[PDB]
Structure 1
Amino acid sequence: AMIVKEVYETAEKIKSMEIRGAGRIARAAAQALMIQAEKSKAKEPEELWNELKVASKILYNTRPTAVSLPNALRYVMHRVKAAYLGGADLETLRFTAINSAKEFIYNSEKAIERIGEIGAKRIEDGDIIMTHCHSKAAISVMKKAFEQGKNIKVIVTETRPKWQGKITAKELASYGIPVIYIVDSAARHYMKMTDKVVMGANSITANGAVINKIGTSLIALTAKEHRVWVMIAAETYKFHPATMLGQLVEIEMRDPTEVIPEEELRTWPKNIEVWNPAFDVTPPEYIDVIITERGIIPPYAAIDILKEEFGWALKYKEPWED
């Protein structure tokens, strides 16, 4: 197949984390599929279909852990697959792909703004909020509560190794929200003065577990210890349909040089291994609520998000498959 450069550039930017955050990479995969359709020089519907299947595979094969990315490719390709199998012609297939993409992209932006509005109602004037990493869904909550005139302060953990906490601190301070920045190790010491914890999600399992930036689970554990509400802000496309049939979520392991730069690491001896897990798993018993664009749920109702929106698709193979 004849795959446009934008697909390759996107895939590479997803792998290197220059595009990152679970929602954003989903949107960038949809965007990529959209541009593959726009720019295609295919003549038959079969030729375009083949390009879209292949582009989908390229994109799925970037980062494994956040299910948002495959749920985006699905959203488009289920629609593209049904059209192509209904005998759709060229421009009818092209436009299905283009329009399914723009739809997911739009719904994603709206979902995040509605999570903002729902989550903000659980934030109370004077609250101190601890967060972790840089999650747009979590930030939408915090930004909206501040825009409602609540005087909040946010504790931002730095989030090693990639320092996403820096993105968050600058971003929240740019909306006029006072920020307290701390190392991750400090999360227990400050849990006592924290009122609410608000974090994002890469994937959410059928039993209510949340897979999110390495460290999330420690924050949630001491939050529970202290009876501080742990709220997860997560779009419905963070829920992981394959876990309904027993699948485990793979934990991405990333380059040791994100932890120790190459210039330093090369001088270390062989007998030191550097392990760099990008996510950990937080059990549902340590999560108060999940805030989706459809409302507040206990973490144990993740199975209902799944049954009602994705469970249909599990009896079929992946839409980009043969």
Structure 2
Amino acid sequence: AMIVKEVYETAEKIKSMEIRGAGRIARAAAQALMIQAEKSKAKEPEELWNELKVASKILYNTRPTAVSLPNALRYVMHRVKAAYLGGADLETLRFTAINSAKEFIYNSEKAIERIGEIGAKRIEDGDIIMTHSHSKAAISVMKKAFEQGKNIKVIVTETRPKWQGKITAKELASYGIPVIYIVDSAARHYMKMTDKVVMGADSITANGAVINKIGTSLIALTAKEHRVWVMIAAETYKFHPATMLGQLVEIEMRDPTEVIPEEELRTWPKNIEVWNPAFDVTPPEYIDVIITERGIIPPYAAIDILKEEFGWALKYKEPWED
């Protein structure tokens, strides 16, 4: 109930997409629990516990699709709950929250570096890589492959409505990587000159399906058509535990004004609806490998990743639950 404003700002910024990208939203949420814990004026363990739960709920209710966010909160809160129910004093519980958040953040960073190291080995001298949206994990791969001295070019799709491709383009450019910027529509037209595809992931399912920025499935489709390897770069905390037990991932429908700006949209007739899904789902047949910090896998081994790391917790309710 005495929730610090750093939690409230992180939430608003997640919603507004000032903080965006699956890994980043996750790190931002770990962070927010950290700050809440650091700054809490609680006197009993029970008071802090309550704050961490209510803050976790606020943070969870921001954006649904990327499972990295709930996974970050679970990492922190599985540990916090266990300390709490085990009778931890106020300070043991504060540190358990703070240090758990710190680990997630630190492991998130090492996981992305490691993915780049692993992914890069699948890039070859002279490769033309097509990507989509802005993925820290995808970019780690392309960036490392350049640093090894491979001469790559990267086709960057624009990624409407939010123009994520601009970010990716400028960022790749600044590491010395040449870029070809194209609109989303042109992905089939350039698939013939493309040697590899490398994209990120918001959530990966028990069957190997990849939920990622709207348009990912199209690029994968025509990549398959063309026999261009589709490689997805993704941390194990992108894997979705609830889909083990039959859960479908919700696809976020964002405001129509991200597609068509406010001033214009209200001049339009009432019988036009603008629909703005932030993600689509890419079937496993169309994915060559998923690149995790633990190694290369075929998409269908998503279940192993889920079994050995996340399944244990599916008997329990969420660690923030009241």
Decide: shared fold, TM above 0.5. yes
* Residue 267 of structure 1, CA deviation: 0.1
**In structure 1, what is the Cα distance between the partners aligned to 2:21 and 2:50?**
29
Q: What residue in structure 2 maps to residue 121 of structure 1?
A: 121
1:232 positional shift: 0.1
1:271 deviates by 0.2
C-alpha distance in structure 2 between counterparts of 1:73 and 1:115, whole Å: 22
The SS at the match of 2:161 is: coil
Instruction: Report the Cα offset of residue 60 of structure 1.
Output: 0.1
Give the deviation of 1:77 after TM superposition: 0.2
Tell me how far apart the structure 1 counterparts of residues 259 and 101 of structure 2 sit (CA, whole Å).
35
The runs of 4+ residues in structure 1 deviating greater than 6 Å are none
Give 1:241 deviation, angstroms: 0.1
* Structure 1 partner of 2:38: 38
Alpha-carbon displacement from aligned partner over 1:118-149 (angstroms, at most 9, x marks no partner): 00000000000000000000000000000000
User: Which whole-Å CA distance do the structure 2 matches of 1:321 and 1:282 have between them?
Assistant: 32
Query: 2:16 & 2:82 partners in 1: Cα distance?
Result: 33
Partner of 1:234: 234
CA distance, structure 1, for counterparts of residue 41 and residue 256 of structure 2: 41
Question: Residues of 1 paired with 2:259 and 2:279: CA distance?
Answer: 14
Identity of aligned residues (%): 99
The 3-state SS of whatever aligns with 2:97 is helix
Distance 2:5 2:320 in 1: 19
> Partners of 2:261 and 2:98 in 1: how far apart?
41
Q: Distance in 1 between matches of 2:273 and 2:291?
A: 38
Q: Report how far residue 33 of structure 1 moved.
A: 0.1
Cα distance between partner residues in 2 of 1:115 and 1:222 = 25
Aligned to 1:152: 152
Provide, for residues 74-123 of structure 1, a one-character-per-residue CA deviation record: whole Å limited to 9, x for no partner: 00000000000000000000000000000000000000000000000000
2:79 aligned counterpart, secondary structure? helix
Q: Deviations over 1:130-188 (max 9, x none)?
A: 00000000000000000000000000000000000000000000000000000000000
Cα shift at 1:45 = 0.2
The CA deviation at 1:32 is: 0.1
CA distance in 2, matches of 1:87, 1:57: 23
Q: How does 1:28-177 map to 2 (within 5 A)?
A: 28-177=28-177
**CA positional deviation for 1:46:** 0.1
**Structure 1 residue 62: Cα displacement:** 0.2
**Structure 1 position 59, deviation (Å):** 0.1
Cα distance between partner residues in 2 of 1:210 and 1:313: 22
CA distance in 1, matches of 2:80, 2:181: 46
- Per-residue CA deviations over 1:214-240 (Å, capped at 9, x if unaligned) read 000000000000000000000000000
SS of 1:32's equivalent? Answer: helix
SS of structure 2 residue aligned to 1:189: helix
Q: Secondary structure at the match of 1:146?
A: helix
Q: 2: distance between equivalents of 1:88 and 1:316?
A: 21
TM-score (norm 2): 1.00
TM-score normalised according to structure 1 size: 1.00
Figure out how many residues of one structure are paired with residues of the other and give that number: 322
Q: CA deviation at 1:24?
A: 0.2
- Spell out, residue by residue over 1:209-267, the C-alpha distance to the aligned partner (whole angstroms, 9 max, x if none): 00000000000000000000000000000000000000000000000000000000000
Offset, 1:316: 0.3
Displacement of 1:19 in angstroms is 0.2
Return the alpha-carbon distance in structure 2 between the equivalents of residues 255 and 50 of structure 1.
32
Aligned mates of 2:5, 2:277 — CA distance in 1: 30
1:295-310 to structure 2, matched below 5 A, reads 295-310=295-310
Deviation at 1:203, TM superposition (A): 0.1
Alignment partners' CA distance in 1, 2:264 and 2:273: 14
* Aligned-partner Cα distance in 2 for 1:248–1:57: 20
Q: Distance in 2 between matches of 1:168 and 1:316?
A: 39
Q: Corresponding residue for 1:320?
A: 320
SS at match of 2:155: strand
Q: Partners of 1:183 and 1:139 in 2: how far apart? A: 19
Cα distance in 2 between the residues matched to 1:148 and 1:29: 33
C-alpha displacement at 1:314, in angstroms? 0.2
